[PDB]
Amino acid sequence: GGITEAQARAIVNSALKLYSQDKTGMVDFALESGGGSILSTRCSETYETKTALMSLFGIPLWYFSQSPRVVIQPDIYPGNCWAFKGSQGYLVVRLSMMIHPAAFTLEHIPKTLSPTGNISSAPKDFAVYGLENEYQEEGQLLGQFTYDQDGESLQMFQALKRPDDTAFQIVELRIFSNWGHPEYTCLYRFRVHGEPVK
Amino acid sequence: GGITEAQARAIVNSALKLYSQDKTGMVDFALESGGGSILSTRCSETYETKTALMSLFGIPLWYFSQSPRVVIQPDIYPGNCWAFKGSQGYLVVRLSMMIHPAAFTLEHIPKTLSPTGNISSAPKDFAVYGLENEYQEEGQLLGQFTYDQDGESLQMFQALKRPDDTAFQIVELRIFSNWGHPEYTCLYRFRVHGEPVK
Amino acid sequence: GGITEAQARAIVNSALKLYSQDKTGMVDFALESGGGSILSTRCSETYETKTALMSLFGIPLWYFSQSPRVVIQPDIYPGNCWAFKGSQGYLVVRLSMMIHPAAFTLEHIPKTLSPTGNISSAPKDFAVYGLENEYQEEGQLLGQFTYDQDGESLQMFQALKRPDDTAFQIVELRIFSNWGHPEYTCLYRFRVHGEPVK
Amino acid sequence: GGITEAQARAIVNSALKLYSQDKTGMVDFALESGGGSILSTRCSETYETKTALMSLFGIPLWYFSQSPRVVIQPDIYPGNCWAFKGSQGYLVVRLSMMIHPAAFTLEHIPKTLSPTGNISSAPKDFAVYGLENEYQEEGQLLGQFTYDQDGESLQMFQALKRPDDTAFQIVELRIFSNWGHPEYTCLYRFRVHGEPVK
Amino acid sequence: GGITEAQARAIVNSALKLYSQDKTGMVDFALESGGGSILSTRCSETYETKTALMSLFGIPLWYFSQSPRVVIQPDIYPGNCWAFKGSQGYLVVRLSMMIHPAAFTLEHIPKTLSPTGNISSAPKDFAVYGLENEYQEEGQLLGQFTYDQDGESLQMFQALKRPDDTAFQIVELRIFSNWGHPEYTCLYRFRVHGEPVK
Amino acid sequence: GGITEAQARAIVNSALKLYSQDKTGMVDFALESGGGSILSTRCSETYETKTALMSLFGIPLWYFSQSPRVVIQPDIYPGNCWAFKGSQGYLVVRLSMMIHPAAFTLEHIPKTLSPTGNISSAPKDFAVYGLENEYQEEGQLLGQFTYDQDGESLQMFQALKRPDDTAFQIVELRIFSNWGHPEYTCLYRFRVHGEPVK
Amino acid sequence: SPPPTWPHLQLCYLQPPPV
Amino acid sequence: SPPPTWPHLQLCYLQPPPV
Amino acid sequence: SPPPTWPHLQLCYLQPPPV
Amino acid sequence: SPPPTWPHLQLCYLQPPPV
Amino acid sequence: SPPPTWPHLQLCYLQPPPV
Amino acid sequence: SPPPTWPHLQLCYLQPPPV
Ligand SMILES: [K+]
Ligand SMILES: [K+]
Ligand SMILES: [K+]
Ligand SMILES: [K+]
Ligand SMILES: [K+]
Ligand SMILES: [K+]
């Protein structure tokens, strides 16, 4: 019934190895440093306000806000997120390889770390689509899902299984609602997983 | 007396979850990305030397030194610290919310990672104060403490309990001594924890 | 034979403490933020292609590729690596202190995270040399080794033991082969460990 | 019949005084430094070629071509002219005051200074119009004229006299032909003269 | 009584030679390109308004106004002048050599070229002082004068003759009144003439 | 014997017309704005000193000195000249057209405008050569001359006449001596005149 | 005083980067 | 190698400059 | 040769950033 | 939108320039 | 259109940085 | 303090400019 010291050490070491591999141990074909990129003309407008002012030698120089690129970068400290106006928005990503998409990951900060006391800005209902080229207006539905505010920070979602699985190198994320924030919605990180084409 | 494999897995997973939440699982109201900021005209002078030279196309372009902003950023690799001259100094931070402060965190690198073989540049005796506005010269004492060079990298400190707990959005960190370095003192990260006002 | 809950908690906590200390618990005298630097005129040419284009206000502005400096920076997400042309190359590093070198670390991404499906760009056979000054053409051999593509992401290598151990502040890494990639070789992180001179 | 030394000195001094007053002694309400400006979205495209390359530290940095702003700047050395593609083009200018326009000036270099041996790039047939606002598509004709390649460098043109003289603060210059250059037309300086409104 | 063709040609050629020598044929020890400079902390504030907006790729980038440096630069097209608020102001210049000052020149545009129809912004009553060092508050009076709005564009003024003529390398120009403009005063060019010290 | 008023006016107007045509009425195939350029790797080193310091927001930013490009730009106010170390130097220019060179112009400031009281920095003995390509070490002599410090500001020099006149698009100016300045020689403007090839 | 907004620096790949 | 084209710096007046 | 010192780029918040 | 004001670039001479 | 290549910003230490 | 020296911006023509 009980475990030995050697067995406990092996369990710990295996868990830290998986943690070190981007928490999941799975390729992220959206990650910017590995070859993913944002298709900027196909994203929602950024939530525009006068919040962050950058100065040099004491005089106002320019305002700063996060761009959609941060959604395909791994830092998820509070504020390292892209914000769009309201509760409906979209983001289009070009992947580092042509793949058969199998699953998607969304991360948000946990409530225990939020400096507003809530994660009401998190996405709630969303869907993912595959696009055959950068000009296609309506892509193929790959799945519809809900990010659970009472679940874990990192949540994974399985793509629909079809008889003929088409390959894609462009994916659209569409947000339909948030967890109640009345001004904006915040996206920390979106990942795309699957099998490369031969 | 002994634990099962399932119990060991649960202990490991809970420890990694806490580790992933900024090591503490507690909001840091000083963190810059979440809305904290340095009040620059209320900090000590930076330790000024000709150490780091940045070049472009082969010709000297400008010298680099870390600014006080790094004290409210999470990277704590050796050198990712703000240095001030001597062993007395101060830093003033504006918080992301008005709060009742309850505790403070200081981090320094461990001796096992120092490329000088010591952490004599670490802070030793220090205190924390609350300021009602950015022009107030003497704030209210929130506690006096000592960072222990023989303790852990991350150390937490509990604020004084008073009968009437005043709320603050500005905090001063004052260093009174270091662990022996004869030229400067280095600060890696300072955090502020507490309860937001309604 | 079996372990208690307290014993399991202590094993977990010790493993996370070591993980938090740059995975190894050992000083890295090559790390740039702590005082290491690349001697640029003594590195191989960078693999030069038109891959990454940076724009501002819609118009092409400049191409981006990683520099040899990333080899002495800790982020090892896919693509955060220096690439040189072919399968023979070299990198020269100035260390943060004069030391007796004892060991070296090389990291590469695991195959499970590669967006090409392979780590054929990883280094295979390599050697390390100590240089007495920045103009010396042939340094003293400190060891010859092979990075194992079927091993762990982080691999450590022990320096040769000699009767008279000379101290060095400059080290050359020479790559003799890779794991099969026909165009380039990629280096994620190189570390240098040892005992400082008194 | 003959003139005295005093009379000759007075003639010389008067001619140099007029020369010093922008050659004409008349206000130019298009001049940029005095408050004129180009309405950029209402000009022809600039003749686009790879001619002038600017470098810094030896590496190509960016190409340079003259903008339409030079047409309302006084330097008329060879090449200090705006070039548009072909022999039909247009330029829209906002004036420094609301005026009744009375006359217009065009300058081109003389043939004796051209490094191509000709002034075939000079404008030939042109017209000038007054616009009531920056969005008006067709303005009021103020005159149609021909720049004479066998005339002087600076040529003046009188506006049409109407019974009710409308005031304008925006003027369009339209070029209908050039003196034979098969690729582009070059404009050195355009001026607008008249009476300010009370 | 009358002059010959050869005599007229000689008069013309002599007048153009003098014109070509900065109109005066006299060294200007204030001229910036020859070694004069503005002592910026000893000038009046610049007339501050939102007039000139510079853009790049369509978005507002920064406002432009002329600095006091233009007063020691030779271009005097309308607008190439420094403006200060009101009708009292001052400018301090360091000269290219230590000299005995003998005379001063002020230029303003002629009324015939002003796009406002007046030169009411021109200086009227002014004085010039010599300063022994850059920190001296009250210098020695070198003369008090009036710029005549009904005179010529370029006007010269003779310094006071004293029994012991002190040498100076720093000069203050003080304006006491203007020709009526209710918001600002404009200075086009100030020159300083004299004999260098051995 | 004497001239009429009409005749005097015609003499004045003709002299001002010639003055307005770059003083000479002749094409300058070296002029930068018209298509001439400096071949930078074939010029002498620039006289290097710490003279002119440019600042922004109060802090030293960079030193300024004139480049060889100013020798093919028309402004000749004091200081708008290229300086090289000592009294022997050279400058290589690419012309705007392939020509048969016929004459050369050198300008220097007159002594009456020098803020040092002398033109001892002016060139004295010099020669001009034609080069068939940018790598040719020794070109064909086009003439040897002396700039006269007791002559006029602008001096012209006639090229040697040969039985077979070769055409050139690259010219070297070589200075062999100056008028006595012990540290440097200054060049204000160099021009190249001739007949374009068909 | 107010400054402008820093446009978002944009990044695109003409071919995959080395990994 | 080729660089980009320097966009034309643009200048506009919200009100007349001092003259 | 010596260059100048890179002034510390400064950051302030007129209101809280999105989180 | 509004940008900032271009500070006046300043020029000083540690010794006389060549003339 | 094509731009140039961003030269690699280079970093060297005249003496050790504070740690 | 001392800054660096402003390299001379260089200008070359791949073909003649419009005149
Ligand atoms: K992120
Ligand atoms: K830090
Ligand atoms: K790395
Ligand atoms: K022009
Ligand atoms: K001026
Ligand atoms: K010049």
Author numbering:
A (entry chain A), B (entry chain A), C (entry chain A), D (entry chain A), E (entry chain A), F (entry chain A): 615 to 812
G (entry chain B), H (entry chain B), I (entry chain B), J (entry chain B), K (entry chain B), L (entry chain B): 544 to 562
How do the authors describe this structure?
The nuclear envelope partitions nuclear components from the cytoskeleton, thereby necessitating their mechanical coupling across the nuclear envelope to enable cytoskeletal function in the structure and positioning of nuclear contents. The LINC complex is formed of SUN (Sad1 and UNC84 homology) domain and KASH (Klarsicht, ANC-1, and Syne homology) domain proteins, which interact immediately below the outer nuclear membrane, through complex formation between their C-terminal eponymous SUN and KASH domains. Thus, the LINC complex axis is established by a peri-nuclear SUN-KASH core interaction and mechanically couples the cytoskeleton and nuclear contents.
The SUN1-KASH5 crystal structure was solved at 1.54 Å resolution and revealed a similar 6:6 assembly in which opposing 3:3 complexes are held together by extensive interactions between opposing KASH5 molecules and KASH-lids. KASH5 follows an almost linear path, packed between a SUN1 globular core and KASH-lids of opposing SUN1 protomers, with N-terminal 545-PPP-547 motifs of opposing molecules interacting across the interface. KASH5 and KASH4 follow similar paths, with KASH5 PPP-motif interactions and KASH4 zinc-sites located at the same positions and providing analogous interface-spanning interactions. Thus, tip-to-tip interactions via amino acids I673 and F671 of opposing SUN1 KASH-lids contribute to the extensive 6:6 interface of SUN1-KASH5. In contrast, SUN1-KASH5 is an intermediate structure that utilises both KASH and KASH-lid mechanisms to form a fully enclosed 6:6 interface. In agreement with the equal roles of KASH domain and KASH-lid interactions at its 6:6 interface, SUN1-KASH5 exhibited intermediate phenotypes upon I673E and F671E mutation, with retention of complex formation but reduction in oligomer size to species that likely reflect partially dissociating 6:6 complexes. KASH5 functions in meiosis and is essential for fertility.
